[PDB]
Design a protein around this ligand. Structure first.
Ligand SMILES: Cc1cc2nc3c(=O)[nH]c(=O)nc-3n(C[C@H](O)[C@H](O)[C@H](O)COP(=O)(O)OP(=O)(O)OC[C@H]3OC(n4cnc5c(N)ncnc54)[C@H](O)[C@@H]3O)c2cc1C
Ligand SMILES: Cc1cc2nc3c(=O)[nH]c(=O)nc-3n(C[C@H](O)[C@H](O)[C@H](O)COP(=O)(O)OP(=O)(O)OC[C@H]3O[C@@H](n4cnc5c(N)ncnc54)[C@H](O)[C@@H]3O)c2cc1C
Ligand SMILES: Cc1cc2nc3c(=O)[nH]c(=O)nc-3n(C[C@H](O)[C@H](O)[C@H](O)COP(=O)(O)OP(=O)(O)OC[C@H]3O[C@@H](n4cnc5c(N)ncnc54)[C@H](O)[C@@H]3O)c2cc1C
Ligand SMILES: Cc1cc2nc3c(=O)[nH]c(=O)nc-3n(C[C@H](O)[C@H](O)[C@H](O)COP(=O)(O)OP(=O)(O)OC[C@H]3O[C@@H](n4cnc5c(N)ncnc54)[C@H](O)[C@@H]3O)c2cc1C
Lengths: 215, 213, 212, 214
């Protein structure tokens, strides 16, 4: 599964451990213990979250650094990113489409706003090349590249933490760009753990957009 | 699907696994934006210089059955997930850990070791019979169970990743730890070895701190 | 500050880092009572709790082991229990007859209390008989019941502390742990009145704290 | 106490709970004898009993370049609170020619400083231009360089702080963040002198802290 985000980014599922039943098996130990589907619903509405920690995912994500920084703020998880110290950075930046500024009255037209951003990206990247070409160390030459540069990383997280992540990013208060990545994460989650997902929205989900956007 | 019996009535059973040795290689190799010969070499490299974040992408789920005094020690490992049987929600099964005579291999005692075994079974039986008694007299299960000894068996699920798993082994797979916990740590290591050959070997060679593996 | 719990336990404050204003400084990233207290309620009401992690406490607790097993399940915190390698005593929790109040039991509540005492004595004697006999404590102590008292140091921050109160300062929790949580709650109120106030009004998920 | 780092950054102490003895008291689970209490710190450190050191806590206020904060926020056992770029200054980290010392370059070291200052100025110009044009802050800021300075509060306990020093107060870490960990180390030394010495002697895995002073 690979979903395309923005103009050049993406969310891709690498691996998965367990499914809805993993949560059920884990919960049975307490009381010595169709019907299973009813237990998940029960857990969800009564606040028994731990059982869901036994479902785990690993995603491959390519996103603009300003999005990555917000994502990494989630501590209950594991990360592994491409290094800007040990690698030659590619010429890939997130250039917002004109429709992104729709809703805001601006002096200059959306195409103009979009034209300038690209321009600054070229001057920035061109300079980055002179320096690397001139013998400057990569780890120091990259401080000139803008926050709209694309980066890649792996993310391993369990169901319970993932639901905390959707509560916060698949919401209208979070930035538009990362909301797009949230929907992709939500979609994949629904495909792998449909019962848990349904119960989530119906009982514990605190955000707004997932109750108005299919999958 | 593996299972290993511990002590007289306990066990360690593997329920699931996510990934393998290459999971660590793929998570790491993504740093340089990038063959069998190379891959094993990479894992040892990471292990040598302490780059352990990549091994966090390997996960295990166990099902354990052990006495309460062992479980308590085990639960101190916070970087992991747990689900246990509730003593305040169901009737408790007459299953206690009774040490065998050999347990005293090295200690000379007033009375024969066989008698120590007999004595332990007695106080356990007496305590168990009082538990059933108070229960049938209408006493709340959560209250009646407080008379039960620490050798009563419990059960739980444990989901943990490879990095934390290696931390558990450095601490419990060691002679300084109690003999009962060692037995369980040995079982955890045999399963870890089975599923992650390269990683397990690299661990024993450039990082394992214990002394019984 | 020390509060006695049950028949021989307690919760005592050992140290504290910060107060309500610690959360205000963290949220504004820098360094008028009215202005600050309005922010604390603002953050509480919208779910922005990270600022409260910058407040921390360290308690010294003395509880029965079964109460301690539930308590230790709270992973986002620090613990240190007595082992007898640096600091051992032997006392047990014997419920009062009022504990069985409400339940209609076969024998008198006063007899339930007696039977618990009897077992404790027999279990305790057997234990000493084994030590004087030459069995190492690590083995001998496994015959001691779950109502055996222990002690530990607990260091936890405000965010996690409020999670602890949402689960233990509640009727679904066991009565014994409830008593310890009520104690934890009073001390918290004393050191962070504003934060405690806002907690009860917008985020407190339990029931018993609003009744006492 | 506050300490300057790089061309415009710093590390500032905001608060602290406990001292060396807070570990001693936690290890014994109690509450006097210096020779003894200090002897225990060393024992704990030598035999790996590190949980007692979790009972000492700090809060720092840091100002640093975004490419430094990113590497830093990587430490999960800790608490963070940064300034909002999409809601909440013309300050960027401009390397000195002495920073490119030891590297053979086709152009004068001073030219690098000038090449980097130029783009920073350009970018910043187009940014302030977009803001005034009506473009939302969260959008117009995507054109700013990774060397833009940010600020955050950091609360971490002594055990976790020792892990940070192991990895960052070391020659394998970028030179920039090495400077910050040195300041972190200095404050830590001042507040918990017994733990720091024991740490350096029995557990520290890095290199520079045994070479440089405080
Ligand atoms: C009435 C009652 C009955 C209970 N019955 C049982 C039972 O039968 N069996 C049983 O095993 N337990 C039982 N518990 C314990 C309960 O399941 C929790 O373990 C306990 O409340 C500690 O909570 P926590 O996980 O939220 O907190 P902490 O472990 O202290 O964590 C605080 C927060 O960080 C989180 N977190 C920490 N680690 C992880 C992680 N690895 N993955 C995802 N999120 C994480 C969550 O957001 C959490 O709320 C019971 C508790 C109560 C109050
Ligand atoms: C021989 C032996 C004797 C012992 N004696 C005692 C005793 O007298 N008293 C007692 O209370 N316990 C005792 N213990 C338990 C021990 O102190 C730890 O609680 C136990 O090993 C759990 O380990 P951990 O902290 O390494 O693991 P986890 O909790 O699973 O943590 C793994 C890693 O994450 C870390 N970490 C997690 N959370 C935090 C945090 N909040 N702050 C800083 N770092 C963190 C560290 O890098 C740690 O190694 C003993 C254990 C052994 C093996
Ligand atoms: C020279 C250098 C180069 C680096 N290069 C890269 C790179 O190319 N790509 C990249 O992505 N990162 C890179 N890093 C970051 C590195 O991978 C770690 O993320 C960083 O050092 C944070 O360390 P930590 O995990 O030890 O600490 P913390 O996250 O603060 O954790 C402290 C302790 O608790 C633990 N712990 C916490 N959470 C978990 C968990 N979920 N599972 C198991 N144990 C846990 C461990 O015992 C740990 O040491 C680099 C770091 C250095 C110093
Ligand atoms: C719309 C929006 C705006 C934001 N604005 C800002 C801003 O201006 N400044 C800023 O600094 N950040 C900001 N953030 C980041 C926010 O403050 C959190 O850091 C982020 O949401 C990560 O969430 P978390 O703590 O719930 O998750 P995780 O770090 O993944 O933790 C999950 C659970 O474990 C817990 N937990 C983990 N560690 C600890 C701990 N050490 N102590 C207590 N509990 C713990 C809690 O129960 C928590 O819910 C913003 C986030 C959103 C979604």
């Amino acid at each position: 599964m690979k979903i395309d985000i923005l103009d050049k980014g993406f969310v891709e599922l690498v691996d998965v451990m367990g499914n809805d039943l993993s949560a059920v098996r884990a919960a049975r130990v307490s009381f010595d213990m169709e019907r299973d589907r009813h237990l998940i619903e029960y857990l969800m509405k009564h606040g028994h979250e731990t059982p869901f920690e036994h479902i785990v995912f690993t995603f491959h994500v390519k996103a603009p650094i300003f999005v990555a920084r917000q994502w990494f703020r989630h501590r209950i998880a594991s990360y592994n990113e491409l290094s800007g110290r040990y690698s030659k950075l590619s010429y890939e930046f997130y250039i917002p489409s004109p429709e992104r500024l729709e809703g805001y009255k601006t002096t200059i037209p959306p195409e103009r706003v979009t034209e300038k951003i690209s321009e600054i990206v070229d001057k920035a990247y061109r300079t980055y090349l002179e320096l690397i070409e001139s013998g400057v160390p990569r780890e120091v030459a990259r401080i000139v590249l803008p926050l709209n540069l694309y980066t890649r990383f792996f993310w391993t997280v369990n169901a319970r933490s993932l639901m905390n992540f959707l509560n916060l990013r698949a919401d209208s208060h979070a930035q538009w760009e990362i909301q797009q990545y949230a929907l992709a994460i939500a979609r994949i989650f629904k495909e792998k753990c449909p019962w848990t997902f349904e119960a989530f929205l119906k009982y514990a989900y605190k955000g707004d957009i997932l109750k108005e956007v299919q999958v």
